[PDB]
């Protein structure tokens, strides 16, 4: 049973992001005294939408899954309760890149691993979970740059477009519940995590990728998109191709993606990654 | 809301960690999940365990040691967590030849993190509390973040050393904390000299305490007053001079304020540089 926290014990509140999905600000909770994250929108429509995604973050519980905290719901606010993120998103990370001038392999490498963790759990789950949503905007980094799987407002029992496979472009039942959207999500989160690059930067209008995806057509592969020194480049370009595949069937499933990364990131030593986070600490520091 | 059940044929790769009466512990890998986790396992056995799982499934927080699922089956009960790769605080204090100098940094993380942990729990509707906090319970994450463990006797509102004499209660759980902050600042056994867990209990019931000292606790301590004075208010005989949690939290929340995040980060690696090295 999830908590229900009174709107009053939120202290310092302080507005960080607004999207689609909702407004967010931080605040610290003022008897647990830990700093916290909070998504908030009157209405009654939307009350319900918002009670929905806390139950299925309250349910989908996992360690690579955004812990709520509870639920402030009250006349006066309404909103979702989280731990606070201190890393911000993956896309500050990988697109700040005069904040980040060196993202190392081993933690990009992990940060891929981690979200294949988490939405394999979801799809794992009795009933499966679809997310639906995925993006970089929605892969937060704790203190340490673990990850959390964020935004749930889309997700299904069983620019913002770049991650939408073609075949739900015009949604139907036929593929309204489909199991293949999230890997090509990934596929896609995939691609931009190992160049730090926007998908289909060089298109003007979001129409336009539509219609280019339609027809197939996908962000580049090469060496200026993927550079030679991706450890396992290859292995890497062959997981984009299939999980953003044209076909959805042809298109694996995250455990077998998981399958195929444990391998490769059993390579990396373990110590590499945090060495890699203590980098981006110490460079962003010197700034 | 449910907490998932988990058949044990999906555990592979069984393997002992510990065993303690709370039960065996063992780490094994999902083969479904691809993560590791731990596993602690064993009529009336049957209703204890169940107990344990549903009140780590309500009392779930960021220092609380989070749940995955319940093995409850006719050959295997067993209740499944994540996997803490560095082992318990216990281990971290005395382990002295594998870790020679603990960064006082990270020490005063983990005090906070358990404060803040108990300090939840504490605050729950109904408040629960833990009863059986000890260094062995406190475990440690990849980067050596708190997770508190072992529900079995926790309740809604050597194994002796962290219990306060008229228990021979509300303010259990802060005289355990005391010691526990005793314990780490010394690194020291409590009670290092006594062959006998009675000799504890008899000096204990007495209103003596650890040996607070130049020995034990050494000038150099960062903080060393202010600590002293959190810990012997703790401890106190006189149950209605403990603190709450919330009073911990005030005295630790300055003292954390002072230090840097990279310095806990490099006291985190030196640790696991030196675990790899034994
Ligand atoms: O764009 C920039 N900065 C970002 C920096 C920090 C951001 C964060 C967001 C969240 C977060 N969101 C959230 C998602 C959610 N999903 C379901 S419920 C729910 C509740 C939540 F609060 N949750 C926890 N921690 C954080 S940190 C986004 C703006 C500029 C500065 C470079
Ligand atoms: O003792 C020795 N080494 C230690 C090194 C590593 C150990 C670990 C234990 C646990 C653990 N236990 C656990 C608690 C729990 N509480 C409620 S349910 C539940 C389920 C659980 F699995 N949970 C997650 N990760 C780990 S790592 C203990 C042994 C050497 C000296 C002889």
Redesign the interface.
Known sequence: ???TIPYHKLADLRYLSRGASGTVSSARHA????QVAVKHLLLDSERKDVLREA?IL??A???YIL?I?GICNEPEFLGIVT?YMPNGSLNELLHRKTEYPDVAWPLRFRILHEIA?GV??LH?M?PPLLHHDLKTQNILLD??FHVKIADFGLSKWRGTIIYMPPENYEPGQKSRASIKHDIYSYAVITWEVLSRKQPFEDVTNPLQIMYSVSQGHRPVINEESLPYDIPHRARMISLIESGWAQNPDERPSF?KC??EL?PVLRTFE??TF??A??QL??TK?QS
């Open positions: 049973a999830l908590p008897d647990w005294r830990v139950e309250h349910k519980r996992f360690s812990p905290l731990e963790l394999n759990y794992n009795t203190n340490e455990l998981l399958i444990e373990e110590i945090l060495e986070v203590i600490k110490k520091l």
